[PDB]
């Protein structure tokens, strides 16, 4: 039931997503620089993260799955 | 039933759902050009061995196979391309001497740069 | 030192000359000079 909310969803946000294309190339940067190294998250939620999260594994992980390579 | 093999498929199994999940969510939002998908195949098309090109153009033309009298026929064009990339290894291609394997892995030639400007 | 250093030019010197009778000629005897302080430091090096 997923795909036909989907599919009416898909090009809702197309043209909505094509509009910006600047922001949206903003934002998505934000997103992943603040999850590659999750500095962000003392002050935000009291817990630091930043010293458990291995910042390699994740771009290994984000380049292996943009790749196609295991 | 020998975890040492599952994991390795259960990560595998993760990378390439995430790949084609991605892919999929991507051209919807984006719908694909009509006509470079022809691109991108003209770009895969460069990139295959000449070893195929006899098989290749006997698929055009209806000669080919069924089914798998193609499955038995890339095998030998397969084989020849391995043997091929195995005497290129060890005592050099199609034009080139000893002297040019030696100073092919001793890396005492930079790449031109003169020349590319 | 300064014998020493003289006779190590000295020893480039004619082992170049000797390698390339052709500019040998004393017409070159200039660019031998640019060739010879050249070879008494290091290599030369191109540009790839
Ligand atoms: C969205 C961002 C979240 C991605 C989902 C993460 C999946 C959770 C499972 C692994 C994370 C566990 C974790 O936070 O603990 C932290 C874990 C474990 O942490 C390590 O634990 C080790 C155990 O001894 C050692 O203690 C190390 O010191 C400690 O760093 O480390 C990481 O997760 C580092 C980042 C690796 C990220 C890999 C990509 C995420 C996995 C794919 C998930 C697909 C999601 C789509």
Same mark, same amino acid.
């Given at each position: 039931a997923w795909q036909q909310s989907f599919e009416t969803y898909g090009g809702k946000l197309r043209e909505v997503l094509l509009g910006q294309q600047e922001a949206a190339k903003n934002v998505a940067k934000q997103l992943d620089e603040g999850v590659t190294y999750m500095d962000w998250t003392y002050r935000?939620?009291?817990?630091?993260?930043?010293?458990?999260?291995?910042?390699e594994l994740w771009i290994r992980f984000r380049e292996a799955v943009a790749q196609n390579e295991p | 039933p020998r975890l040492a093999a599952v994991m390795p498929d259960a990560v595998y199994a993760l990378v390439q759902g995430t790949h084609k999940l991605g !892919? @999929?969510?991507? &051209? =919807?939002?984006? *719908? *694909?050009? *009509? !006509? &470079? =998908? +022809?691109?991108? !195949?003209? /770009?895969v098309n460069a990139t295959i061995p000449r070893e195929f090109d006899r098989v290749r153009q006997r698929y055009a033309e209806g000669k080919i196979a069924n089914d798998e009298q193609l499955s038995s026929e890339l095998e030998d064009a397969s084989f020849n391309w @391995? +043997?091929? /990339?195995? +005497?290129?290894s060890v005592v050099g291609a199609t034009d080139e001497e000893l002297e040019d394997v030696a100073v092919r892995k001793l890396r005492l030639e930079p790449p031109a740069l003169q020349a590319s400007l | 030192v300064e014998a020493a250093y003289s006779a190590y030019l000295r020893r480039i010197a004619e082992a170049y000359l000797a390698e390339h009778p052709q500019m040998a000629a004393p017409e070159h005897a200039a660019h031998v000079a640019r060739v010879v302080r050249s070879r008494a430091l290091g290599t030369p090096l191109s540009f790839d």
């Amino acid at each position: 039931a997923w795909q036909q909310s989907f599919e009416t969803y898909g090009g809702k946000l197309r043209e909505v997503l094509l509009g910006q294309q600047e922001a949206a190339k903003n934002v998505a940067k934000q997103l992943d620089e603040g999850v590659t190294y999750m500095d962000w998250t003392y002050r935000s939620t009291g817990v630091d993260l930043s010293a458990v999260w291995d910042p390699e594994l994740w771009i290994r992980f984000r380049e292996a799955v943009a790749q196609n390579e295991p | 039933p020998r975890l040492a093999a599952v994991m390795p498929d259960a990560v595998y199994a993760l990378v390439q759902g995430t790949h084609k999940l991605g !892919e @999929y969510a991507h &051209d =919807l939002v984006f *719908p *694909p050009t *009509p !006509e &470079d =998908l +022809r691109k991108l !195949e003209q /770009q895969v098309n460069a990139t295959i061995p000449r070893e195929f090109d006899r098989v290749r153009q006997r698929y055009a033309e209806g000669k080919i196979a069924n089914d798998e009298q193609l499955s038995s026929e890339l095998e030998d064009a397969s084989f020849n391309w @391995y +043997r091929r /990339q195995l +005497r290129t290894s060890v005592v050099g291609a199609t034009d080139e001497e000893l002297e040019d394997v030696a100073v092919r892995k001793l890396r005492l030639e930079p790449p031109a740069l003169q020349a590319s400007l | 030192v300064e014998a020493a250093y003289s006779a190590y030019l000295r020893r480039i010197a004619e082992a170049y000359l000797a390698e390339h009778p052709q500019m040998a000629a004393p017409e070159h005897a200039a660019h031998v000079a640019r060739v010879v302080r050249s070879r008494a430091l290091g290599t030369p090096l191109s540009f790839d």
